Amino acid sequence: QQGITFSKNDVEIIARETLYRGFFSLDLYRFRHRLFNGGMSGEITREIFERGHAAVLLPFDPVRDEVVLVEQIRIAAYDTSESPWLLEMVAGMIEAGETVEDVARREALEEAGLEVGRTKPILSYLASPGGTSERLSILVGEVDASTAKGIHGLENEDIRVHVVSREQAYQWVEEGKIDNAASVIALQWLQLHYHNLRNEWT
Amino acid sequence: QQGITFSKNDVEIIARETLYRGFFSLDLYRFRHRLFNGGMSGEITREIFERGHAAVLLPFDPVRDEVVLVEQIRIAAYDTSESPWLLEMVAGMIEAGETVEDVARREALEEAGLEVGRTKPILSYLASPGGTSERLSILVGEVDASTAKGIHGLAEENEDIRVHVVSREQAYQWVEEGKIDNAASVIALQWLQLHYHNLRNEWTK
Numbered sequence: 001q002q003g004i005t006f007s008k009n010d011v012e013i014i015a016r017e018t019l020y021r022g023f024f025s026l027d028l029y030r031f032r033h034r035l036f037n038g039g040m041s042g043e044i045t046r047e048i049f050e051r052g053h054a055a056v057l058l059p060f061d062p063v064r065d066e067v068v069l070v071e072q073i074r075i076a077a078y079d080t081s082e083s084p085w086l087l088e089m090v091a092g093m094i095e096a097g098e099t100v101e102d103v104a105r106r107e108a109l110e111e112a113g114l115e116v117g118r119t120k121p122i123l124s125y126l127a128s129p130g131g132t133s134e135r136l137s138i139l140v141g142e143v144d145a146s147t148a149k150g151i152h153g154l155e156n157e158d159i160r161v162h163v164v165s166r167e168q169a170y171q172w173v174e175e176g177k178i179d180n181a182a183s184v185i186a187l188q189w190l191q192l193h194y195h196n197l198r199n200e201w202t
Numbered sequence: 203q204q205g206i207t208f209s210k211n212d213v214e215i216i217a218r219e220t221l222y223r224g225f226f227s228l229d230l231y232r233f234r235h236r237l238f239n240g241g242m243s244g245e246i247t248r249e250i251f252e253r254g255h256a257a258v259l260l261p262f263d264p265v266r267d268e269v270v271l272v273e274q275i276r277i278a279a280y281d282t283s284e285s286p287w288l289l290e291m292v293a294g295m296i297e298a299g300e301t302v303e304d305v306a307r308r309e310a311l312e313e314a315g316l317e318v319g320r321t322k323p324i325l326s327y328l329a330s331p332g333g334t335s336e337r338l339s340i341l342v343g344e345v346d347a348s349t350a351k352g353i354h355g356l357a358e359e360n361e362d363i364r365v366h367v368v369s370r371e372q373a374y375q376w377v378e379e380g381k382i383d384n385a386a387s388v389i390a391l392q393w394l395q396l397h398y399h400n401l402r403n404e405w406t407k
């Protein structure tokens with residue numbers, strides 16, 4: 001019984017309340033939960049940043065062993081980063097009735113001008129589950145990186161396409177030049193799986 | 203290759219307006235920024251979740267090829283996860299006048315009952331920079347897994363946090379399978395899968 005965790009039957013959600021509602025929401029969860037030493041906690045409250053969930057596309061060209069990155073400003077990066085312009089994966093929020101794949105394919109075209117061939121799921125992760133419910137689901141998508149260039153984006157969206165070798169992109173993760181979770185996770189996954197992925201797609 | 207195009211001088215933060223202030227806060231950033239084809243944008247606003255920044259420690263026993271994980275409830279995971287109790291890295295929020303390593307070492311003791319030997323940086327990442335400023339900085343720490351006092355379940359912190367000790371291969375398999383699916387642990391364990399061979403050699407010489 002390694003890694004067996006407590007379950008949803010060990011927590012009682014008492015109420016969910018909305019503290020702020022705008023573009024996103026801030027909710028308050030009130031709950032009680034089982035303690036590892038036995039028995040139950042008192043009522044606990046936690047603030048939860050509720051912004052829905054997102055799809056992420058790692059655009060990989062298996063013939064060229066290249067990745068397509070998109071550069072855009074993320075103002076929230078400002079206070080802790082050298083620059084708020086980040087090198088990132090194609091990504092977008094998911095709405096009702098849409099799939100991860102729908103969003104990934106649409107954003108690849110809107111954000112990078114890319115048609116996508118085959119896709120494969122990589123990983124789905126919680127961005128920061130002590131304070132936000134956000135989950136992101138990553139796919140790898142087959143692209144022609146020789147086509148990828150220019151300035152894209154809609155609505156105050158200004159995006160520059162960069163094409164780099166896989167090895168260079170991964171080194172940029174190691175060095176801290178790429179340092180947003182979605183790109184780090186996707187490019188680490190690629191560094192662990194590129195051999196078989198290139199074989200599969202050629 | 204060339205890299206990013208613009209710097210902090212290319213953005214003007216006009217204001218940061220409080221939308222919510224409680225334990226954490228939500229700010230409306232109002233700003234204008236330079237455009238790739240020249241000139242500046244008009245005014246843009248973004249809602250940004252402000253919760254400070256964190257230190258994360260991957261506790262790795264290089265002699266045994268084992269990892270120490272901690273389990274605790276993360277209620278925000280509930281709506282999209284099998285359980286809100288997650289298997290995670292040791293982690294804590296950073297306060298003014300503390301380094302990442304100060305926090306990582308303190309939390310290793312408070313959360314897992316562990317002293318740490320050598321450390322190395324893994325990487326420092328932005329959790330979700332379209333909507334939150336949060337940065338988390340990960341170190342790998344040399345531990346003797348047998349000495350995790352948190353294994354006994356006895357401290358009061360152990361009512362809230364439970365210690366698991368697993369093989370590296372099992373921890374990584376759990377990433378592949380989706381059992382471990384919080385960003386900090388995914389990032390740390392993928393890094394470990396890419397670096398364990400050299401790291402074990404370094405730390406067992």
Ligand SMILES: Nc1ncnc2c1ncn2[C@@H]1O[C@H](COP(=O)(O)OP(=O)(O)OC[C@H]2O[C@H](O)[C@H](O)[C@@H]2O)[C@@H](O)[C@H]1O
Nearest residue numbers: 023054091092093155156157247248249250330331332333
């Ligand atoms: N914080 C915000 N406040 C207000 N409006 C916003 C905000 N963020 C986006 N919009 C609006 O929504 C549009 C952008 O929508 P899409 O492309 O689907 O989302 P994404 O790529 O931003 O976020 C996807 C993930 O990647 C990131 O890391 C995030 O943290 C997520 O985890 C913008 O044009 C704005 O008009």
Ligand SMILES: Nc1ncnc2c1ncn2[C@@H]1O[C@H](COP(=O)(O)OP(=O)(O)OC[C@H]2O[C@H](O)[C@H](O)[C@@H]2O)[C@@H](O)[C@H]1O
Nearest residue numbers: 045046047048128129130131132225256293294295296338
């Ligand atoms: N949502 C919340 N609302 C209110 N109080 C909270 C909340 N979360 C924590 N506290 C309070 O803060 C204390 C916990 O503080 P520390 O141990 O330094 O932070 P951590 O391990 O939680 O967060 C570290 C990272 O790991 C996670 O992934 C997070 O997303 C972070 O990214 C709790 O005892 C509460 O009193």
Ligand SMILES: [Mg+2]
Nearest residue numbers: 090091092107
């Ligand atoms: Mg986007």
Ligand SMILES: [Mg+2]
Nearest residue numbers: 091092107111
């Ligand atoms: Mg978009």
Ligand SMILES: [Mg+2]
Nearest residue numbers: 292293294309
């Ligand atoms: Mg903690």
Ligand SMILES: [Mg+2]
Nearest residue numbers: 294309312313
């Ligand atoms: Mg703590």
